């Protein structure tokens, strides 16, 4: 019943977007066609926050907060809120949209974590107060999708933990995104326009480079992104003979766990790509353009690449690594052929 997505903050926004008549997966995320490889690597000394070279993929583009805001006409703002206002803010944003409330993994019992606050904070959506008097929270992640009840005393201790490693004390992402009367009638028109703009940015294939204290950040867009991602990922093939050793030292197991974590982050981004391309596809079908474009299935290609990364994460072989590369190259070729076909039909 509740919407979900590979990224918890994305599925959370999908539930809030349904409150106000917006189809996030089809009209917002499906309207932003993007493909981007990113690298964090050594740049100019000093860069103290650069712990390791890191490469990942992203099909999010500008991201849903940028597109959801300018499409509906509203705002998506981050804010730290004092402890007394939180309940008032949660009740208030329910009118013009909703709230994404940040939480350590330790505070969500259904996540089972309990003994660790996670690497990154979690996100849930307050969904009113039950007749019981406790709060209803929606979990946006696909694995733990559904509604969960929390007492007000527990909700307030969760939003203000001590200690606070993730700095989430009273953190709130307010979604004032209820479109006006005319805006709701213009939704598919703007989705058609955003679909064309994203495909143009995709085929422009711009590059970029910035120097930060966390390292040099390189990114490449468009059809070249996934082939460039595959070529860079070949450098981590040393993990396969390493992981095959049960005769491992402590420091060596750190490199294995770090390399495995890099492929877990990649696997989640491949799952989002499949989720996004399926929304792009439901939008093309809704615009009455599926017949003109053809029967290409970029969402299924990204789904197979997602399965390959899952299989590589569970067991780091050279064959599983090579199987991920083939699934990624196939997904890249279907992507650029579908993008070129779809842009021509949109004129």
As annotated, the binding site includes 313-314
Give the nearer residue to a copy of itself in terms of CB position, either 135 or 236.
Answer: 236
255 binds a copy of itself (CB under 8 A): yes
Phi, psi of 339 (to 5 degrees): -65, -45
Q: Which of 1, 46, 128, 246: binder of a copy of itself (CB under 8 A)?
A: 46
Q: Which of 30, 98, 170, 215: binder of a copy of itself (CB under 8 A)?
A: 215
292 binds a copy of itself (CB under 8 A): no
Longest dimension (CA), the chain: 66
Taking the complex as a whole, the smallest distance from the CB of residue 291 to a copy of itself amounts, in Å, to: 32
212 binds a copy of itself (CB under 8 A): yes
Structure letter (DSSP) for residue 75: E
* SS3 annotation, 147-216: EEEECHHHHHHHHCCCCCCCCCCCEEEEEECCCCHHHHHCHHHHHHHHHHHHHHHHHHCCEEEEEECCEE
Answer for the pair 236, 262: CB distance below 8 angstroms, yes or no.
Answer: yes
Give the nearer residue to a copy of itself in terms of CB position, either 172 or 343.
Answer: 172
Q: Which residues contact 97 (CB under 8 A, 6 or more apart)?
A: 16, 17, 19, 20, 74, 174, 175, 176, 177, 178
For 210, other C-beta atoms within 10 Å of its C-beta total 10
- State which of positions 258-287 bind a copy of itself (CB under 8 A): 258, 260-262, 265, 269
Phi, psi of 289 (to 5 degrees): -130, 0
Q: Which of 146, 213, 291, 294: binder of a copy of itself (CB under 8 A)?
A: 213
Q: What is the dihedral of CA 82, 88, 91, 94, to 10 degrees?
A: -60
Q: Which of 18, 232, 297, 340: binder of a copy of itself (CB under 8 A)?
A: 232
144 binds a copy of itself (CB under 8 A): no
Binding mask 63-102 for a copy of itself (x = CB under 8 A): xxx------------x-----------------------x
Phi, psi of 302 (to 5 degrees): -70, -25
Structure letter (DSSP) for residue 3: -
Taking the complex as a whole, the smallest distance from the CB of residue 290 to a copy of itself amounts, in Å, to: 28
Structure letter (DSSP) for residue 5: B
Q: Is 29 helix (H, G, I), strand (E, B) or coil?
A: helix
Taking the complex as a whole, the smallest distance from the CB of residue 285 to a copy of itself amounts, in Å, to: 26
Q: Which of 30, 74, 98, 117: binder of a copy of itself (CB under 8 A)?
A: 117
234 binds a copy of itself (CB under 8 A): yes
Known binding residues for (R)-4'-phosphopantetheine: 313-314
- State which of positions 146-205 bind a copy of itself (CB under 8 A): 163-168
41 binds a copy of itself (CB under 8 A): yes
Give the nearer residue to a copy of itself in terms of CB position, either 119 or 184.
Answer: 119
Tally the residues of the chain.
Answer: 347
Q: Which residues bind a copy of itself (CB under 8 A)?
A: 9, 36, 38-46, 48-54, 56-58, 60, 63-65, 78, 102, 106, 115-121, 163-168, 210, 212-215, 217, 219, 231-232, 234-238, 241-242, 245, 250, 252-255, 257-258, 260-262, 265, 269
């Amino acid at each position: 019943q509740t919407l979900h997505a590979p990224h918890c903050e994305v599925g959370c926004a999908a539930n809030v977007a349904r409150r106000v008549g917006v189809d996030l997966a089809r009209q917002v995320i499906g309207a932003h066609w993007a493909s981007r490889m990113l690298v964090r690597e050594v740049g100019t000394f000093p860069q103290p926050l650069l712990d390791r070279t890191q490469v990942t993929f992203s099909a999010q583009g500008e991201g849903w907060p940028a597109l959801l805001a300018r499409m509906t006409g509203g705002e998506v703002t981050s804010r730290h809120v004092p402890r007394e206002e939180l309940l008032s803010t949660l009740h208030a944003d329910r009118a013009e949209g909703g709230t994404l409330l940040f939480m350590e993994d330790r505070a969500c019992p259904w996540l089972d974590s309990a003994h660790s606050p996670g690497m990154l904070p979690h996100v849930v959506v307050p969904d009113g107060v039950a007749p019981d008097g406790s709060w209803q929270l929606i979990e946006g992640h696909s694995w733990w999708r559904g509604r969960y009840a929390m007492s007000e005393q527990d909700l307030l201790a969760a939003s203000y933990p001590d200690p606070d490693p993730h700095h989430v004390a009273g953190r709130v992402l307010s979604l004032r995104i209820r479109p006006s009367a005319e805006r709701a009638a213009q939704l598919d028109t703007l989705a058609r326009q955003e679909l064309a703009a994203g495909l143009r940015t995709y085929l422009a294939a711009e590059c970029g480079e910035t120097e930060t204290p966390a390292g040099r950040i390189v990114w490449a867009n468009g059809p070249q992104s996934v082939p460039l991602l595959v070529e860079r990922l070949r450098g981590w093939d040393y993990l396969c003979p390493l992981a095959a050793r049960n005769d491992l030292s402590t420091e060596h197991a750190r490199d294995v766990a770090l390399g495995r974590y890099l492929f877990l982050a990649l696997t989640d981004e491949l799952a989002f790509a499949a989720y996004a391309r399926a929304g792009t596809l439901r939008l093309v079908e809704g615009l009455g353009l599926a017949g003109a474009v053809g029967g290409l299935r970029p969402d299924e290609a990204w789904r197979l690449a997602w399965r390959s990364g899952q299989k590589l994460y569970r067991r780091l072989d050279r064959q599983n690594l090579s199987a991920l590369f083939s699934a990624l190259e196939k997904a890249a070729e279907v992507d650029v052929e579908y993008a070129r076909r779809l842009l021509k039909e949109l004129k």
